[PDB]
């Protein structure tokens, strides 16, 4: 997975990303590192507006370009939403928007904060000699003081890392199929099941580091976007770059390649059907980095693991396949419990159906997606 850019240890996450840019972009780095203070003051909007258009040509390598997207992404969100109380801006300055739109065109991403920015690239190791764990880790950027953005983003990253153990087994599954190696295929599927079972235990940790009320009222508005959002109904206008206001979906873990990776592997056709959920999951691949878009493409091109397993009249092999599907159902069942605690209950406390940051009708969306996953269970062969 050299051309796919999937690490053995961290999977789809960017391994050890850059913390600081070259000196030419210190105007950017100063605004982004002090977003908690500059928003609370009410002087962030002016600070962005009175700032020269710095060009993008001095960002040499990929990790520099990704850190720039993160800086420019976080800044763009804090500008548009401002204090987050309702006073918004429907126009992004030409000095910030043009180089952001150019950098985003270079990396084949939309010019808006995505999962790849604020999770996969928004982290660091405290002590490099220690292991990957919450006490040894910290994010690079936050929005406000008491938004739980450290706990929020790192819990996602921890799941991505847990999934990396499963992702690295996928080449063995296809080799074992081509080579008609039944026992290897069985062991590989049981390993993937075990890794995805373990990723559920990493999910549990979100309660310890993320407060529901701090999440729903403070952080969630900055993660929101402008695709079918009433606050910016026709979209946001990027001054100088584009002519009309352009709609782009807000960030969400739907932009993660992990869950899509295993749905495709296991023949769970989420993106098939032409419904609103299928449409969303396919549309969110635009918001994944192009190497992972390519990985998911490569995965669909391979022979079906499901078809292979069903054809063989083999209880152990079916059971192993079923365990992977059960694991994905569990994670989604637990994800709905999280959604009850972190969206549903908090929204009932503030003074027809509820919209997610990605733009989905979330309760129907999520239960459709879970139901599709449930239907793929063999139910004792
Ligand atoms: C406070 C925590 C969380 C909330 C409130 C939440 C909420 C949601 C919502 C509303 C959606 C629907 C898409 C949208 O409209 O944006 C969604 C989708 C999704 N979420 Fe989360 N989520 C949370 C944490 C997580 C975590 C930790 C993961 C870890 C992998 C995750 C994985 C997903 C995935 C993969 C989808 C796409 C649908 C699917 O494949 O089942 N979410 N989430
Ligand atoms: N989609 C979630 C927000 C969210 C959850 N996990 C994320 C990861 C990255 C960006 C946004 C998110 C919501 O509507 O509340
Ligand atoms: C979760 N989006």
UniProtKB/Swiss-Prot annotation:
Per the UniProt record, the source organism is Homo sapiens
Explain what switches its activity on or off, per the activity regulation comment: Activity is inhibited by and MTH-trp (methylthiohydantoin-DL-tryptophan), modestly inhibited by L-1MT (1-methyl-L-tryptophan) but not D-1MT (1-methyl-D-tryptophan).
User: Could you tell me the Gene Ontology terms of the biological process aspect for this record?
Assistant: 'de novo' NAD biosynthetic process from L-tryptophan; female pregnancy; inflammatory response; kynurenic acid biosynthetic process; L-tryptophan catabolic process; L-tryptophan catabolic process to kynurenine; multicellular organismal response to stress; negative regulation of interleukin-10 production
Report what the protein is called.
Answer: Indoleamine 2,3-dioxygenase 1
Q: Return any one Pfam family short name.
A: IDO
- Does the keyword Cytoplasm belong to this entry? yes
Q: Which SUPFAM superfamilies match?
A: Indolic compounds 2,3-dioxygenase-like
- What subcellular locations does the record give? Cytoplasm, Cytosol
Q: Which reaction does it catalyse?
A: D-tryptophan + O2 = N-formyl-D-kynurenine; L-tryptophan + O2 = N-formyl-L-kynurenine
């Amino acid at each position: 997975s050299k051309e796919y850019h999937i690490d053995e240890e961290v999977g789809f996450a960017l391994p050890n990303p850059q913390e600081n840019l070259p000196d030419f972009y210190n105007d950017w780095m100063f605004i982004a590192k002090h977003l908690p203070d500059l928003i609370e003051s009410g002087q962030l909007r002016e600070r962005v507006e009175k700032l020269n258009m710095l060009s993008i040509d001095h960002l040499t390598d990929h990790k520099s370009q990704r850190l720039a997207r993160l800086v420019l992404g976080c800044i763009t969100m804090a500008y548009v939403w401002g204090k987050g109380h309702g006073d918004v801006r429907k126009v992004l300055p030409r000095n910030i928007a043009v180089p952001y739109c150019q950098l985003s065109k270079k990396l084949e991403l939309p010019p808006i904060l995505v999962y790849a920015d604020c999770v996969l690239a928004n982290w660091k190791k405290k002590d490099p000699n220690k292991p990957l764990t919450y006490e040894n880790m910290d994010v690079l950027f936050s929005f406000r003081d008491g938004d739980c953005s450290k706990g929020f983003f790192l819990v996602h990253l921890l799941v991505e890392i847990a999934a990396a153990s499963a992702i690295k087994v996928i080449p063995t599954v296809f080799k074992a199929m081509q080579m008609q190696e039944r026992d290897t295929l069985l062991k590989a599927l049981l390993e993937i099941a075990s890794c995805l079972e373990k990723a559920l235990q990493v999910f549990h940790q979100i309660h310890d580091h993320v407060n529901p009320k701090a999440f729903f009222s403070v952080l969630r508005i900055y993660l929101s976007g402008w695709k079918g959002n009433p606050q910016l109904s026709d979209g946001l206008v990027y001054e100088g770059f584009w002519e009309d206001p352009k709609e782009f979906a807000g960030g969400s873990a739907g932009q993660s390649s992990v869950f899509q990776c295993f749905d495709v592997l296991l023949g769970i056709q989420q993106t098939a059907g032409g419904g609103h959920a299928a449409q969303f999951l396919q549309d969110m691949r635009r918001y994944m980095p192009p190497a992972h878009r390519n990985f998911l493409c490569s995965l669909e091109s391979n022979p079906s693991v499901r078809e292979f397993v069903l054809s063989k009249g083999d209880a152990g092999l079916r059971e192993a396949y079923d365990a992977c599907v059960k694991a994905l159902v569990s994670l989604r069942s637990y994800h709905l419990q999280i959604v009850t605690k972190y969206i549903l209950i908090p929204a009932s406390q503030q003074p027809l159906e509820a919209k997610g940051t990605g733009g989905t009708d979330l309760m129907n969306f999520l239960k459709t997606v879970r139901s599709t996953t449930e239907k793929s269970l063999l139910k004792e062969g």
